[PDB]
């Protein structure tokens, strides 16, 4: 019987931190602010623009 | 033999296969019109005699016995009765006891057919090969049909056996003449065998039944059944 | 709290990862077509969509881990439901690889006239089914034994040797994918060869892709077990990993037997 | 911003059901526009509105088939009615695995965009509904349209797999207390069985079309004749998907019809165990026959005999189901509202379609009738009549519930009669032409067949009138200034209901359950 | 309880030892290819040229 | 109650379908063509007289649809 | 081990020996002659389903929206259903 | 927000609801019968 390489109280501190905020699940933490409002957002914007341009070019038969 | 305006049911038969097909469909339709009329009658009498103004009390029965087994069993014997003839037709149509007398390859090219009665040549290169093109709109005489008339039709001796080897060269196709009751698929790799035996003279029309590329339905098939002497004269003249 | 909610099931909170993942899938598919046929935006669009799917999947699993480990929303019943769902997913994958095996068999029982009516086609130098493929089977067998060792590490209360067993299994899976890569490079026949080469390479490639994803699943479970996220009573991630790896090993066993033994005979 | 969160983000199985319904309506209208274009082209012999370009006609038939067989019935039976009325009816809180629910629904619209862009690229996909290999090969198309369509099928298939896993785990795990498996209603049961079929069969289609894709682009030889690999392999795989595919479009219809008959006959479903076992057996025997769609390709005699027998045996249980429904109307106190109208029409027209199917199931008869409009009549009655009429019946029966308002009755009956007359006029001459012998999927016909195709073309416009009436009904429902009552409808006013979903509220609040139901479960 | 862990530990160690031996066996093989087969019709087909056309992937 | 309304609406629907058909396939408000085989109005005539005796490539003219039309030659 | 929130409450109950929702299975003898056939509810009014049955007979299922002030008898098998709140009796949605 | 509402929709509240729903259904029909026609129009606009 051995705890796995962590004190396991860092996890308890993290549990306190997560249960001690008043937001949705995906916005908890300071990491998730940056992550889940900037990376997917800009990434989806670029994806949408490239998808539109690609459909346009394929339909019109231009830019082979 | 040819399609008719405002027609009900099958065309005319020129093959024992087509006689079998007509008989099997008529037996099936007899059984199934019995089924359909009985079901409609029971549904109608159930809806009408209990129409909220005669029986306003639900009468509350939910478990049924000795009637569920009855409508489980009786459709079974119905199916047995309507599967007795189908199996007999299959296992009396498969057998070819007699040797075929000729051999007519029907290679299904892309938007036009081809044929080779190759069994008349002393060499290796094949004689008596031609192409079966649809006649365009303006190339018709005053009588023929539209998009169903062919240049240089298939010629076949009547009252003698056949063996047509359907196959393709570009894409999927199907050799399909309904009056003879012949439909099979030409797959670019295989060589399907159809044994048929016409019973009377005259011309029979049919079309492609598979999606070829763009001129689908403009890829028709015409088979003439003519007397053996005339068939011999025609082949000797074509060689 | 449950006493006010009055039921132990799970009620999740909104997250845009469904829609984001769907947009990533559309990106991947249009990029795939635009790279399959030569076009200007093809490669970049395909790569962008693929990394979009990877990113949304990452944040999705991160969200599930966050909920279930720190918030503690998983109760016994949803714990069971996760096992149900993953068994169903494995059944779906079984049917997929069944379809591929049917393709192979329908192409190899009665070989057509156009490959000589014989199998394997003349001029395709079949791999000896005993030099590399046997070693791959032995490697996956040892990997399965190591996964079982990891499971009995977690169960027996010995939560330290679990990481040792998991890292041993990851090493064996990496050795397997390396030897599969060596086999692909040293192949005496390519994909564009006859139906034999074609079905061989398609089936083996999808099996290797499943090996990659199972290996990365095992890596995730190893990191979690090192960090302490798993306990003797409550662990589903590891059970999913073990079942998936056993699936991959069984598929490899069928693949080895049929293709490598029979096809070479 | 709160509304976009609540729609694009929320899990909320009810809201996903609403989104599924809206998508189903849009896809249905698109499919009907394609059908009307097809009918306009086929109205008279010669080039009618296409003015040539039979390739565009083949593209139209393909797009119509995909749109209505994948984006109209499935997003309405499974996503539409399934998502809503599985957890409400079974007595459970929000569905299991809500995020899978959301991802499946939001996967669907990109699949729609792929399908339309496939119909729009360089020339088009003129390969029919069932993409066959050699025509969809790179020698004969060389466009990319088939690639886009194949990816559309991939996205739709993945979404349906996710939904099926959702429903299976929910039924097996997320039931209420005391509710044994044999107390879940038949809608739940049909959704379970159809979800099993969708989970088992659909991956085979994904494998087959992946193989077709790598045959086209990455230059394999799976379906190239030179090198083995006959197209028969693809026929086998696609139809091993195809028949389980068609016993999925109708099973939720069966469930909804059972519920409607039960609630209109004042009595529950006669022979409950018979219904359950018959439906399970239909599900099982939907797999053991898959080549009854390719009798005329060159299989040996014994396979044809076996598939004949298998189709007859799959015919029996549907007979048990229909006779059970007829029995559970012998009680009394019927009341002819529009849901009952549509259920009755379903039973009648599905009977006609099924009998035609039996005629088609034999071998020799299929030799004579393969790929002729006899088959088109068969599956248009079966699929269109059955699925769409069950859909309309469910829609009325439960727009009593979703929005909280209620449709006007005279317009409901007018719509039923218009649609019934139109769509039953426009598909019986298909039987007659198929007997005459015209091949399927042709833009022009010989002059002989021009007699009926003028009459059938007269049937599409009536159905268009019916659909426009239906949308007038939907708008007048969503703006009806008179809420749910007892004079209007007697269903939701029940203080005692056979099905759990009628005694809750006008719409469910947000969690559908302040507290879960119970079961007395006597014999202490 | 722990006997099972010990037993699977032992057999996994046996497995990796045998596998490492077999890897040593398989390696150090030269692998000389035989001559290319005659160009049968069904070999090296190009229905549609690859995006990286001239030679297949992994070559 | 409403049978008046239902029947009236059904007849109106038939009227509207007829009007749309007449505009879209008899006068073609959307461009199109008509075959030369139907506008000649004498083509069916010869088609029937040819079912009496259909021309052939090798052999004398021969009949078609002998059963369903009851048309055929006698002792000779 | 490690747990907090819903799983913690579940495991605390399963360690203390109490069942969390044991009020959700009435499991009572059929009928009401001098003893009502009783249920339990955490709210004012609650859904209850009767399958009926001494042990041999049964009717399929009937859902009735049982309320506090008025006992309700099963429509088909005719047994009473008297409710007894074990929580704060309030309208289920407040 | 209306998670704690007596009705999930509460459709009555919005501003007269009539023009909004009428436009909604009409635009649904327009998107249903515009794209299928537009695909054919574009294909004839092509070669
Ligand atoms: C979902 C299945 C479905 C439906 C509903 C329909 C509907 C119709 N179909 Fe379709 N059809 C197919 C599936 C379907 N079809 C398939 C699979 C093929 C094969 C293609 C091929 O062989 O390659 C085909 C082919 C096909 C052809 C042959 C094409 C060819 O031979 O070239 C024709 C010919 O006219 C045709 C006509 C019609 C007509 C007139 C309707 C009319 O019934 C129009 C429908 C009318 C309705 C009443 C339904 C609309 C309902 C709504 C929009 C309301 C929705 C409500 C909500 C969701 C709330 N169909
Ligand atoms: C929509 C779902 C659906 C349903 C329910 C059915 C029902 C049946 N179908 Fe159908 N079928 C399709 C979907 C469906 N089909 C499609 C999409 C096609 C076209 C595919 C293509 O484009 O190629 C097709 C075409 C098709 C074909 C021909 C394919 C080809 O050659 O072109 C065949 C033949 O084997 C067939 C068989 C059957 C059989 C035996 C039934 C039976 O299950 C019917 C059972 C119903 C009953 C028979 C009615 C109720 C029974 C009674 C009231 C009891 C009394 C009856 C007896 C005495 C048993 N179907
Ligand atoms: C996740 C769920 C939502 C995803 C939304 C993704 C949208 C991506 C952008 C699509 C796009 O740009 O399409 C362009 C394409 C452009 O088509 P196009 O190439 O024919 O454009 C015509 C251009 N002119 C005018 C010059 C001729 O749009 C469409 O195909 C329209 C589809 C409408 C679908 C409605 C439902
Ligand atoms: C979800 C909300 C999506 C909102 C944005 C949708 C439109 C995306 C867009 O702007 O696509 C660009 C495309 C024009 O292509 P572009 O790259 O601008 O042209 C290059 C020429 N040198 O734009 C177009 O081609 C516009 C086509 C008109 C229809 C737009 C919506 C189509 C998809 C509906 C779903
Ligand atoms: C059932 C599902 C729908 C099936 C439609 C099939 C239609 C069909 O087969 O029609 C063709 C049939 C025969 O056509 P016919 O011109 O007579 O000859 C063709 C070659 N034998 O022609 C007909 O079917 C036309 C009608 C012929 C008479 C049939 C009578 C059956 C009903 C009897 C009811 C008796 C009273 C009941 C009360
Ligand atoms: C052989 C081909 C098919 C032949 C079908 C023949 C059908 C004949 C029907 C004749 C009906 C005559 C009715 C004369 C007036 C009777 C008094 C009356 O009020 O009738 C109306 C009644 C519908 O009223 P109901 O639905 O009960 O009321 C609920 C609304 N408050 O009306 C009814 O109940 C009519 C029910 C008709 C049921 C037909 C079911 C399909 C039959 C196939
Ligand atoms: C699984 C697919 C993963 C795709 C990852 C992104 C690939 C983008 C393209 C990268 C590329 O062009 O790589 C070049 C490589 C061939 O490199 P090569 O020049 O042969 O090597 C030099 C050795 N003398 O060629 C390749 O890497 C070929 C990659 C082909 C990918 C095709 C994907 C089609 C759509 C799949 C949807 C899923
Ligand atoms: C689900 C959709 C999947 C779409 C897959 C598209 C096809 C991808 C592979 C295309 C064929 C290819 O490039 O094969 C290369 C290679 C075979 O080797 P070969 O080229 O013959 O090398 C000669 C000697 N080694 O390697 C292969 O053949 C590998 C085959 C497996 C490829 C796995 C791709 C996984 C994509 C996952 C997408 C998830 C979303
Ligand atoms: C092909 C795609 C295959 C995808 C397979 C997805 C399986 C998902 C399994 C799942 O949901 O597991 C739930 C688990 C939650 O963790 P849990 O075990 O509840 O932790 C208890 C802590 N006290 O979840 C986890 O522990 C997270 C597991 C993440 C696995 C990621 C695998 C990525 C594969 C990428 C392939 C490209
Ligand atoms: C088949 C392929 C699709 C992936 C299948 C994954 C099966 C996973 C099984 C499962 O149960 O996963 C659960 C997990 C979501 O769990 P959740 O519903 O959030 O539960 C809350 C309880 N705490 O499930 C997930 O998180 C699933 C996330 C899947 C993301 C997939 C993104 C790409 C979609 C496919 C594109 C294909 C394009 C081909 C070209
Ligand atoms: C009800 C909704 C009706 C919508 C009608 C839209 C008509 C749009 C239009 O003008 O389409 C152009 C074209 C018509 O053909 P056009 O080239 O104008 O030929 C006239 C030369 N004599 O259109 C075409 O060639 C194809 C489209 C024809 C009209 C289809 C209407 C479908 C209605 C479904 C409901
Ligand atoms: N832009 C093309 C260039 C080569 C094809 C045209 N010559 C690539 O991609
Ligand atoms: Cu089928
Ligand atoms: Mg066919
Ligand atoms: Zn009771």
Numbering used by the authors:
A (entry chain i): 2 to 65
B (entry chain b): 12 to 250
C (entry chain c): 1 to 265
D (entry chain a): 1 to 524
E (entry chain f): 37 to 95
F (entry chain d): 1 to 76
G (entry chain e): 52 to 145
H (entry chain j): 47 to 93
From the paper:
Complex III (CIII2), also called the cytochrome bc1 complex or ubiquinol-cytochrome c oxidoreductase, is an obligate dimer that transfers electrons from ubiquinol in the IMM (reduced by CI, CII, or alternative NADH dehydrogenases) to soluble cytochrome c in the intermembrane space (IMS). Complex IV (CIV), also called cytochrome c oxidase, transfers electrons from cyt c to molecular oxygen, reducing it to water. In the IMM, respiratory complexes can be found as separate entities or as higher-order assemblies known as supercomplexes. Here we present the cryoEM structures of CIII2 and SC III2+IV from the vascular plant Vigna radiata (mung bean) at nominal resolutions of 3.2 Å and 3.8 Å, respectively.
By docking the individually refined CIII2 and CIV models into the SC III2+IV composite map, we were able to define the binding interface of the plant supercomplex. Direct contacts between the complexes occur in one site in the matrix side and one site in the IMS. Site 1 (matrix side), shows a single hydrophobic contact between one residue of VrQCR8 (Pro31) and one residue of VrCOX2 (Trp59). Instead, V. radiata’s site 2 (IMS side) provides the bulk of the protein-protein interactions of the supercomplex, with a hydrophobic interaction between VrQCR6 and VrCOX5c (Leu26 and Leu51 respectively) as well as an interface between VrQCR6 (Pro19 and Lys20) and VrCOX4 (Arg114-Phe117). The limited matrix-side contacts in V. radiata are in stark contrast to the supercomplex interface in S. cerevisiae, where binding is dominated by interactions between ScCor1 (VrMPP-β) and ScCOX5a (VrCox4) on the matrix side. Unsurprisingly given the large differences in contacts, there is a significant difference in the angle between CIII2 and CIV in V. radiata versus yeast, resulting in a more ‘open’ orientation in V. radiata. This orientation leads to a difference of 18° in the angle between the CIII2 and CIV as measured by the relative positions of the bh-hemes in CIII2 and the a-hemes in CIV. The difference in orientation also results in a larger estimated distance between the CIII2- and CIV-bound cyt c in V. radiata (~70 Å) than in yeast (~61 Å). What can already be concluded is that—as seen in yeast —the benefit of the SC III2+IV arrangement in plants does not involve direct electron transfer from CIII2 to CIV by simultaneously bound cyt c on each complex, as the calculated distance between the bound cyt c is too large (~70 Å).
